[PDB]
C-alpha cells in the first residue's frame, strides 16, 4: 500500500485520481523527497497550472524535505515569487538544507510549521577534482552560492547576512517555535 | 459509463476500496514516501468530512521519527477523531502513533504486539560534528519521551528507564501502560 | 503475467485482475511467504468482505511457506475478530505460519486437498550484540513460542505438551495426519 | 514486442485484452514458465474462475514448462482433480519433472502433445543443511515426496512403481511418441 | 476509457498490436520460452477470428531455446491458416529453421536479409554418466532438426550435417537456392 | 517517483493529463533533464507537433539541465530554427554546456532568465583511444565541433570567436544578470 | 524520460496518443537511438502500418543516430526499398555508421540534412573468438558484409566502389554540405 | 638460521615435545599436526608428547587423521585444553592418554553433533545423509568408549551445543584432572 | 655463509647492488614508501661517505607531492652531491626532483621525456572545507613554482603560464628550459665519464 | 618459483636465482611486457654489467609483446649510452616495443630464432576531457610516433616513409622477413 486511488462519479461516469492528484484539484502541492531536477520539474510544472487556473487564488506547498540540489530549489524558490498567488508553506516532519530554505520562501504571513516539525539549516556541500586552477573555480562557485543562499535568507528572515554565515557554520536543529524566532516562519500551528 | 479497473494490488487496489469508507492500512516500516501518502489520505478525509471518525490499522516496525512525526502532527491538526488499531506488531515510531489515536478509541487485538525503545541513528566525522548528533538524538528522545507521557499518563523517568531497551508488552501489558485504551476481544463480535 | 476479466454490467464494462474476480465471490488467495505487505493484503480483503456482507462465509486459500509470526497474527486476529466464518483450504503446502492460519479457519470447516502437505516447527529468528540484548531477544522469541503453542493447543485438541516435543524439529505431515492431528477437520476428496 | 493487446468493439463500447486474457475468455490456460508459488496461485485462480463460468465445459491447459516447485505443482495438480469440467492437457515445446506431472494429470482421453514437443522425466531435487538429524530428516523428506509422485504416476500412467523408479533414476528425455507409448499422455496431435 | 496509443509500451495498443489487426505477427528477438509462448497465443487467437486467410510471420532472429522453436514450429503446423515467413536482416540458428517452416511457396526473404545455419549448442556438467545422457539427448536433437530441415528443403540429411558443422552464412539468394526459401522478395 | 494527473472535462469527454502533457496543450514544453538522443527525440517531436496545430503562435521552452550530447543539442537546434513558430526560453535553475547554448538559441528578444537561475558555458567534452592516427581523427573532430559551436555562439550573442574561445577554456559561471550582459539572454524576467 | 501524450476527440471518445504515435498521423517516424534488433522491428513495423494506411503518400523518417548492428540495419533499409510509398529521410544531430547508411537509403532526391547536422562513415566492426577456422569463418563474413556495404552505398552516392573503401577505412566525418557533395544527400535544408 | 616469535616459537617448544593447537581443524592443520607426532615419534618413541588444544573444530575427517595417529604412535599423548575446545577439538581432548587430559580452570568446551551438507537428486541427498549418520554413530561410539557414558547417553547429550565447564568436562569422563596453578 | 644473489625480490637483489656503488633507482610511482626508502638510503649513503657523489636514476610519472618533498628536502641537507640522469620519463613530481639535483649535475638520456604541469588534487564536503583545500592547493602550487623558478632560472610568471596545462619537452627543450643542465649523447661515451 | 644454482666461490657456497646465475654470463632475460618496473630492472641489469666489464659483449634475450614507450626508451637509452655492445636475440616474439629493442642491438649483432616472430605497428593511447587537453593528447602521441619512425628508419635503413605505411595496421614479420627488413641481421641457424 503505497499511493491510493480516488474515486469520482460524475455525468462522465468513473474518473480516477491518485492521492496526491487529488489534493491538486484543491490547490495542495506536495514536496515530501529529497530535491532534485525531476522533482523540480514536477513542482514548477504544478505551480504554473494551478496559477493558470485561477491566479487570484492561494496555493498550498506542503514540505517534507531533507533538501537537495541548490539549482533545483532555485528552480522552484524563483517559479514561487514569478507567479500571481501567494504559495503558502507548511513544514511537516523535516526541512532541512533546501527544504527550510523553501519553507522560508513562503508568502509573508503565510509560512508555517506543525508544533514537533523539525527545522534544519546549515551551509551547501559540494565537490571538486582535478589541477589546482579547477579546484579554484569550483570552490570560487560554491562560495558565491553560499553567499547568494545567505543574501536571500536574510530578506525573508530579517536576520543579518553576518548571524546567517555563523548559524549555519555546523548543522543547525531548530524546534518549530525556534523556526518563527529565528524569522524562518510565521506562526507554529495549533491544533 | 467509463468503469475504472479493479485489482487487489497495482487502478482501484484494495487499499483504496477501504479508503472510500475511511480506513488507512499502515503495513510496512515508515519512511518519507509512507508518510507523506497517510499525511494526504488524512487531509483528504477532513475535506471529504471534518466530523466522521476516520480508522487507522497500524502493523509497523516503525521508521524514520521525523517521518512518524509527520503522521502525528497531521493526526492532531485534523477535526476528525482518528482510532487506532494494533494487528500483528507496533514498535519504535509505530507504538507511537498507535498511542496518538483519539482518547478512548485506541485498540488492539488480543495477539498483537507492542514495543517500544529508544531512538537510534549514527554520527561520523569530527567531534565537533558528533557532538552535534547526540545532543540532537538526545533532545529528539526527550521529545518522544515528553509526549509519550502525556498520552500514557506514566512519567518521564518511567518512560526512560522503560525504553532503555528493546520492551516488549502484550495487548494487555499495552492497556495497563496506557498506550491503548482497550484489547478487542473476538467474544463481543456482535456487541 | 495476472490475467484480466472483463465483465458486463448495466452501466458498462469493468475489469478485473483474477484475483479480484475470485473476491467477488468471497474468495482469498494466498500463494506466497508471509510478510507484512502480505499481511496488509489479506487483512484489508477480509475487512472489504465484512463490509460486502457480515454473513456469508469466507474461503481463504493457502499455499504459503510461512514467514513473520507477527504478519501471521496480524491476519489471525483479523480472522477471529471478522463476524464471517473463515474457511481454510490448503492446497500444496501449508508451512510453519501457513499451517498456523489453516488450523485458525472456522471450525468444522478447515480443509486440506489429498496431497497438500503440512509443516510445523518452532520460531526462527536473531539476535545480535550485548550479553542483556541477547537475553532480551531469547525471552521474546521463548514468549512467542508459548502464545503459538498454547493457540495450536486450543485449536488442535493437543496439548502444549505434546505440541512442545511435536516442533522441536521440521514435522511434515499429509493431509490424512493433519486432520488426525486436529489442524484440519477434513480432506476434501475429489 | 512481448504481449500485444487485441481490442474487440461490442454494442456498449471498445474492450482492450492483453493476448493471454483473449484467449482465458475461450477457456484456455498458458502454463509457460516454471512452476512457482506465484504460478500455481495464478493457474488455480484461473481453474476455479472457469468452473464458476460453467461447469460442464472443458478446460484447456498447455503446457511449455521445465517444471520447479513440487508442492506448487500439487496445488495445480489437486485444483484439477478437484473441478467439475474436464481439464484437457497439451504440451508444446518442453514438459520437463513437474510440467511432465501435469501433462499426466489432464483427463484421461484427453491428454496431447504436438508431434516435436519434448518430455523429459527424472527424481525430484532439494537440498538440506545443518546437523546430521536435520539432514536426515530432509532425506526423509524427499524420499516419501519422489515415492508420492511415483505412486500417482502409476496411477496415472499404468506403469509399475517399480518401473517408475528405474525409469528415473537419472534425466529421461521422450519423444511426443514414446510419451505416448509411457501413458504420459493419450495421443500425438497430428496436423 | 479507450486505451492509449504508443509506439512502444498501464496497458497500451502498441505498434505491434496495430499489425497483428492485419493478421501480421512481428518477431524481432531472441527465442525464449516468453517470446514463444507470446507467438504460439497469436497462432491461435488468429486461427479462431478466420480459419482461412493467411497470416504473416517476419522474422528478424539470431535464434535462441531449441524447444521453445519447435513450440512455435508445431503450432505453425498445427493451425489450418497458411503462414507466410518473411525474413528481415537475419534469420539465424532457430530463426532460419522457422523461416523454412511457412507455408510451402509462402516463405520469403528480402534481398539484402541473411540466412545463418548451424548445429545446436548446449552444455554439461557432472558425472561421466550424466555427461553422456546430455550428449545423447543434444545428438538426437540435432539428429531432428536435420530430418526436418531435409523434409522443409529438399537437402538429404547427409548435406544438411556437412554444411551446419561450423557457422554457415548465406545471402538471401543462396537461401532460396538451399531450399530454406521459396522467393527473393524484390522491390 | 509519481507524475501528477489533470483531469480536464469537456462537453463529452474527460481527459487525463500527466503534468507535463497539460503543459504542452498550452505549448509549453519541459526540458528538465540532461540532454541524450532520447531527449532530443522527445522535444523535436514536441516541436514538430506543435508547429502542425498552429504554425504562428509562440512556444515557450523552459530549460533547467546540465547540458550533455552535442549532437542531440544541435537536432533540437537546428529543429527550433527550422520550425515557423517563435520558441522563447526561460532558464529555471540552471543552464549548463550545450542547454546553455540551446537557451542562447531561442527567439530573439525572447530568451529569458529567472533571477536566481545559473548559467554556465565551457568548452566540448570528449575522449579518444586506440591507435595514434585514431587520437588524431577525434582530436581533429573535436575541434571543428569547438569551432562550429563558437561561431554559432558568436552569432546569437554579439561576441567575437577569440573572446568566446577565451571565456569557455575553464568552466564560466554566470549570474542571470551576466547572462544578460554576455547576450546569451535577453531579458532578466523581474517577479 | 517519461513520453508526452495529446488527448484528441474522436468517434469513439476521448483517444490518448503518445507523441511518436500522433506524429505517425503525419506520417512521421522518429528514429533517435542506436539501431538494434528491437528498435529496427519498431521502425519497420511503423514502415509496414503507414504503407496500410496510404500506399501513395510520402513517409518522413529523422534520423538521429550513432548506428548500429548491420543486420538490423539491413532490417529497415529493405523495407524501406520494398514498400510503395517513397520515404524521406532527414538528418538532424547525427547520422553514424549504419544510421548514414540509411540516410543515403531515402527516395532520390528526397534525402536532406539540417545545417549543423554531421554524418559519418566507416567500416564494420566485429569481433571472433576461438578456433582458427572460426576466426577464418567470422573474417570471411564481414569481409562480406562490408562489400555489400560499399557496393550498395555506391549505388546511392554515384561514387566508386574503390573511393568508398578508402575514404570508410577510417572515421570519416562530414558536415551536411560536405555529405551533400559526396551523394548521401540531395539537399541541405536551411532555414 | 634466523629466529622470529611468529625459526619460530612453535619450533621452539616442539623440541621439548609440545605441540600446539590453536586454529581450526582443516586438512592443512591436520597434515602438519601428524607430521609433527611422527617427527616426535622418530625422534623417540617412549618420551611423553604434550598436545595443547584451543580449537572450534573443524573437519571431522581431518580430526579422524591427528586421532587415528595419536593411537598409531608409541608415546603417550598429554591433551591440555586452554580457552575453548569445541566440536571436533573436544573429540581430540578426549582422545589423549588415559590419565593424563588436562584443561585449565576456565577453559571451555562444547559437544554437539556433526554438521554437513547435501544438494542434488532424492538418491544424492539419501547417500549423503546415510553417510553423515555412521559418521555420527562412529564419533558417538569413540566418546562413549572414552568418556565411560553410555552411547544413549551421548546422543541425547549431543543433540544441541553442549557447553560444559572443566569440572563438569572432568565429571562427563572428557578429561581426568582440572589443572591447579 | 653468503647471502643469496636474486635480480628481483619475492637476498641481495640487482638494486642493492647498485647501491653498493651509490646509486639509487627510481622506477615507479612516488608515493611515502617509496619516498621513505629512497630518504632511507640517501642517508645511509652519507653515513658511509660525505665526500663522494651519489646518483639518482629518474624514471617516473610522480606522485604525492609531500613524499616528493621529502626526497627534495633530503637531497638538498645532505653533505654528498646528488647527480640526476633522466630515462624514459620524468613527469610532474618526478620531474620536480630531476630539476632539484647537483647544480651542473643535471642530466637525461637523449630520447627521454620531460613533462611539468600543474598539481592535482580533489575536495568534497562544507563550502568553507572546499575552500580550505583550494587555498591549500593553490598554496601548494605557488610553493613549487617559487623553488622551480631558482632552479632553471624561468621567472614564476613564465612557470605559472607553461605549466596551466600539461607541457612535453624533449632533453632538448629540458635543457633549455634549465630542468637539467646537459642531454648525455653516445658520442661522449669515452671521453666523459 | 624460480631455480636456484649453488656456485663455490673463492670464499663460500653461494646461491644464485636462474637468472642472476645467467648474468655472471653476461645475459639478460626479458620475458614479459615492458613496464616501468621491468625497464628499472632491465636498465640496472645493464649498469651492472658495464661496471663489472666495459669492454666485454652482453646477451639480450628478447620474448616480450611489448608495453609503455617510456619505459621502453629507458631501456633503448641506456643500451646507446654503455660502453659494451648489446647482442639481441629474438625468442618467440619480439611485438611493438619488443620489436624495437630488437632493433636496437649492436649493428651485425641483431639476431632470431628460426620461428620467432616480429611485429611493428603505431602507438597505442587515449584521452578523455576538454577539447584543449584531447589536443595536447594527440600533438603528444604524433610527435612520439615520428620519434620512433625516425629512430627505426636509423635502424633498419628503411625510409621514414616506408616505415609510417608499414605500421599503419598491424604487421607481422617472420623471423626471415625481418632479417630483409633490417629490423634484424641475421636468423641463427641450429
Given at each position: 500500500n503505497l499511493i491510493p486511488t480516488?474515486?469520482?462519479?460524475?455525468?462522465?461516469?468513473?474518473?480516477?485520481?491518485?492521492?496526491?492528484?487529488?489534493?491538486?484539484?484543491?490547490?495542495?502541492?506536495?514536496?515530501?523527497?529529497?530535491?532534485?531536477?525531476?522533482?523540480?520539474?514536477?513542482?514548477?510544472?504544478?505551480?504554473?497550472?494551478?496559477?493558470?487556473?485561477?491566479?487570484?487564488?492561494?496555493?498550498?506547498?506542503?514540505?517534507?524535505?531533507?533538501?537537495?540540489?541548490?539549482?533545483?530549489?532555485?528552480?522552484?524558490?524563483?517559479?514561487?515569487?514569478?507567479?500571481?498567488?501567494?504559495?503558502?508553506?507548511?513544514?511537516?516532519?523535516?526541512?532541512?538544507?533546501?527544504?527550510?530554505?523553501?519553507?522560508?520562501?513562503?508568502?509573508?504571513?503565510?509560512?508555517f510549521a506543525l508544533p514537533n516539525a523539525e527545522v534544519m539549516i546549515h551551509q551547501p556541500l559540494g565537490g571538486a577534482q582535478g589541477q589546482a586552477t579547477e579546484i579554484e573555480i569550483a570552490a570560487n562557485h560554491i562560495l558565491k552560492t553560499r553567499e547568494k543562499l545567505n543574501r536571500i535568507l536574510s530578506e525573508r528572515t530579517g536576520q543579518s547576512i553576518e548571524k546567517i554565515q555563523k548559524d549555519t557554520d555546523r548543522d543547525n536543529f531548530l524546534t518549530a517555535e525556534e523556526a518563527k524566532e529565528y524569522g524562518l516562519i510565521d506562526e507554529v500551528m495549533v491544533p
Open positions: 480516488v474515486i469520482e462519479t460524475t455525468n462522465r461516469g468513473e474518473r480516477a485520481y491518485d492521492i496526491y492528484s487529488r489534493l491538486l484539484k484543491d490547490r495542495i502541492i506536495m514536496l515530501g523527497s529529497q530535491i532534485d531536477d525531476n522533482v523540480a520539474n514536477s513542482i514548477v510544472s504544478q505551480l504554473l497550472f494551478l496559477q493558470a487556473q485561477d491566479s487570484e487564488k492561494d496555493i498550498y506547498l506542503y514540505i517534507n524535505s531533507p533538501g537537495g540540489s541548490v539549482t533545483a530549489g532555485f528552480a522552484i524558490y524563483d517559479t514561487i515569487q514569478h507567479i500571481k498567488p501567494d504559495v503558502q508553506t507548511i513544514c511537516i516532519g523535516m526541512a532541512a538544507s533546501m527544504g527550510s530554505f523553501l519553507l522560508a520562501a513562503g508568502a509573508k504571513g503565510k509560512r
